[PDB]
Amino acid sequence: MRIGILYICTGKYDIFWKDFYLSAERYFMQDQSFIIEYYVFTDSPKLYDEENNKHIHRIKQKNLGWPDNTLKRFHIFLRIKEQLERETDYLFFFNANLLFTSPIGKEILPPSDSNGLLGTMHPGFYNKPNSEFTYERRDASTAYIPEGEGRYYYAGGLSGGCTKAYLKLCTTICSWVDRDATNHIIPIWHDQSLINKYFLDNPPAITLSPAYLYPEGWLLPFEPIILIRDKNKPQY
Ligand SMILES: CC(=O)N[C@@H]1[C@@H](O)[C@@H](O)[C@@H](CO)O[C@@H]1O
């Protein structure tokens, strides 16, 4: 089975590629049945272990700056959609500063008879009531979610599923992003708002706990499986 990792590390975020990659080569899908393809969108000339591992696919991408780096995130995946359709069976997106600490296996693969989508609970909202979810509340936006509706507050730092269903998600959100641009709207706060809208219409087959998005330094009711490295640490 072929597992595709989508990874954007333009500008000052390629410092995060090395330790992410090593942790991933160690803890992520290390059953010999799986093969891992890294699709690394960056402006870096060379990536760590690129000359050794043929599954590291460097794709050229410039820094768009904030927020287009976060707003056109799914635009970036779809420029190589055909390559993904023939080389991968599952796709997973990870934030640059994410870090694996414990083994992860087939338990996070959405079953083929489901919608084949995976979402992850945001660490700042897992214990909050519906009334405090910061959804997009403007009916003029494609990311609109009325008050009282919604189940979880999903995050944008980790999402995926089977390649077909996920590219379908990429295609939809791009359209939502573009339609709002015309109507003179930037959805707030975008990396999570559009995906929370999509996961409302399409309740994901798998919902990961914030143990898969554990912010460094926090005290949460979970063992951290994936850590969100503090960006403001001096070593970065
Ligand atoms: C994992 C998670 O939810 N992280 C998101 C991620 O999208 C990041 O870019 C930033 C906001 O842009 O912080 C957020 O919490």
Author numbering: 1 to 236
Give the original sentences from the paper that presented this experimental model:
Bacteroides ovatus GT6a represents a GT6 clade found in more than 30 Gram-negative bacteria that is similar in sequence to the catalytic domains of mammalian GT6, but has an Asn95-Ala-Asn97 (NXN) sequence substituted for the DXD motif and metal-independent catalytic activity. In previous studies we have functionally characterized one of the two GT6 from Bacteroides ovatus, BoGT6a, finding that it has a similar specificity to human HBGA synthase, catalyzing the transfer of GalNAc from UDP-GalNAc to 2′-fucosyl-lactose (FAL), and similar acceptors to produce A-antigen-like products. BoGT6a has a GT-A fold similar to structures reported for bovine α3 GT and histo-blood group A and B synthases (GTA and GTB) but is shortened at the N terminus by 45 residues or more as compared with the mammalian GTs. The structure comprises two contiguous subdomains: the N-subdomain (residues 1–97) that includes four parallel β-strands and three surrounding α-helices and the C-subdomain (residues 98–246) that includes a three-stranded mixed β-sheet and a small two-stranded β-sheets associated with two α-helices.
Because, like most other GTs, BoGT6a catalyzes the transfer of GalNAc from UDP-GalNAc to water (hydrolysis), albeit at a low rate in comparison with oligosaccharide acceptors, we used an enzyme mutant with Gln substituted for Glu192 that has attenuated activity (4 × 10−5 fold relative to wild type). One (form I) was grown in 0.1 m sodium citrate, pH 5.0, containing 20% PEG 8000 and diffracted at 2.78 Å, and the second (form II) was obtained in 0.2 m Li2SO4 in 0.1 m Bis-Tris, pH 5.5, containing 20% PEG 3350, and diffracted at 3.42 Å. Both orthorhombic forms had four molecules in the asymmetric unit, but electron density for only GalNAc was found in the form I structure. Although UDP-GalNAc was present in the crystallization solution, all molecules in form I contained only GalNAc. Form II crystals were obtained from the complex that had been incubated for 1 h, whereas the form I crystals that contain only GalNAc were grown from a preparation that had been incubated overnight, suggesting that the mutant GT had hydrolyzed most of the substrate and that the UDP product had dissociated from protein molecules in the crystals.
